[PDB]
C-alpha cells in the first residue's frame, strides 16, 4: 500500500484474503502509493474454494488507507483499515462483489465498476 | 597528531598578537573622587547615585 512489504487484505469476492506488496508502478524510484494506485502483489493467504489461489502474483488497486487523502476544499478522509481489490487486465474486478466502504476518489478515475458494486461511496 | 616540525619563536610571537587584555573601562565617581566601574557602586562608600 505504501512500502514494498506492507500486508494488505482484500474486500472482493475472490479466493484471496491477504496480499503482500511487491512493486509500486508509475515511475522509476517511486516508493509510496495511495488510494487509486495500481500495485503488484502476491497472494499470501487464500480461502479454500475460489479463482485466486495462494502464491499467485496478481495486480490490485488500493481503495482504503489509514493515512487518508486531502481534497481541494481542505477536508480530509481517513479510514481505520487498509484494503485493496484484485483487478483484471481492463481495470475490472476479478470478483463479483465489493465489501465495506470505498473511497470517493475512485469515482473521478476510470474505476467505475468498483464504485458501482461498492455498498457506500 | 604530533607536530611535524619545531615551531620557531617568530611564529609564536605572531600568534600571540591578539592574546592580550585591556583596561576595565573605569570612570570617575563624583562623590568619592577616585575611579570606579561603570554601572556599579563606589567601593569606598557604596554610593550608586542617580
Amino acid at each position: 500500500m505504501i512500502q514494498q512489504e506492507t500486508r494488505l487484505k482484500v474486500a472482493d469476492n475472490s479466493g484471496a484474503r491477504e496480499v503482500l506488496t511487491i512493486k509500486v508502478l508509475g515511475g522509476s524510484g517511486r516508493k509510496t502509493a495511495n488510494i487509486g494506485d495500481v500495485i503488484v502483489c502476491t497472494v499470501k493467504n487464500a480461502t479454500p474454494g475460489g479463482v485466486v489461489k495462494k502464491g499467485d502474483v496478481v495486480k490490485a488497486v488500493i481503495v482504503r488507507t489509514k493515512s487518508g487523502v486531502r481534497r481541494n476544499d481542505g477536508s480530509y478522509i481517513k479510514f481505520d483499515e487498509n484494503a485493496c481489490v484484485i483487478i483484471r487486465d481492463d481495470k475490472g474486478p476479478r470478483g463479483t462483489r465489493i465489501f465495506g466502504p470505498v473511497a470517493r476518489e475512485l469515482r473521478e478515475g476510470n474505476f467505475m465498476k468498483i464504485v458501482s458494486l461498492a455498498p457506500e461511496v | 597528531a604530533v607536530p611535524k616540525r619545531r615551531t620557531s619563536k617568530t611564529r609564536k610571537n605572531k600568534r600571540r598578537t591578539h592574546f592580550k587584555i585591556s583596561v576595565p573601562g573605569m570612570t570617575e565617581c563624583p562623590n568619592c573622587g577616585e575611579y570606579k566601574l561603570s554601572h556599579r557602586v563606589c567601593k569606598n562608600c557604596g554610593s550608586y547615585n542617580g
Binding site: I77, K78, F79, D80, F99 | -
Partner: protein, 113 residues
C-alpha cells in the same frame, strides 16, 4: 491576535452554525459536485475533537459505516456545509476523545446528559 490579520479575515467568518462540544452526535450536510449534478450528502457521527483557531478552526467527526471506521475533518467556516444539526449531547470528561479509535461495541457509547 494581530490586528492586520484579524481584519483581512473578517468577511470570511460566518455566523450561522450552533455551538457544540466534542462528544455529541452531529449531522453534516455536504454539497458534492460528483458527475455533473450537484446534490447533498448527509454525514453523521460523533465529534471527536475541535482544534481551535479563527478562520482556520477545524473539527472531526467519526462514524461506523459497515464495520470500518471513517473520520472526516472540515474547516468550520468552509463554504461547502449547508447546515449542521445536533441530535443529542453527550457527557465526556476531556476534549480529544482519541481513546474511541480502539474501542468497539458497548465500549464505544457515550451516555446522554
Amino acid at each position: 491576535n494581530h490586528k492586520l490579520i484579524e481584519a483581512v479575515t473578517k468577511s470570511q467568518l460566518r455566523t450561522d452554525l450552533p455551538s457544540f462540544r466534542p462528544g455529541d452526535t452531529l449531522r453534516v450536510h455536504v454539497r458534492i459536485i460528483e458527475g455533473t449534478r450537484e446534490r447533498i450528502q448527509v454525514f453523521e457521527g460523533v465529534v471527536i475533537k475541535r482544534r481551535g483557531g479563527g478562520v482556520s478552526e477545524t473539527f472531526t467527526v467519526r462514524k461506523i459505516s459497515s464495520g470500518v471506521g471513517v473520520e472526516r475533518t472540515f474547516p468550520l467556516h468552509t463554504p461547502k456545509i449547508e447546515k449542521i444539526e445536533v441530535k443529542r449531547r453527550g457527557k465526556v470528561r476531556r476534549a480529544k476523545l482519541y481513546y474511541l479509535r480502539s474501542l468497539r461495541g458497548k465500549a464505544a457509547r457515550i451516555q446522554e446528559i
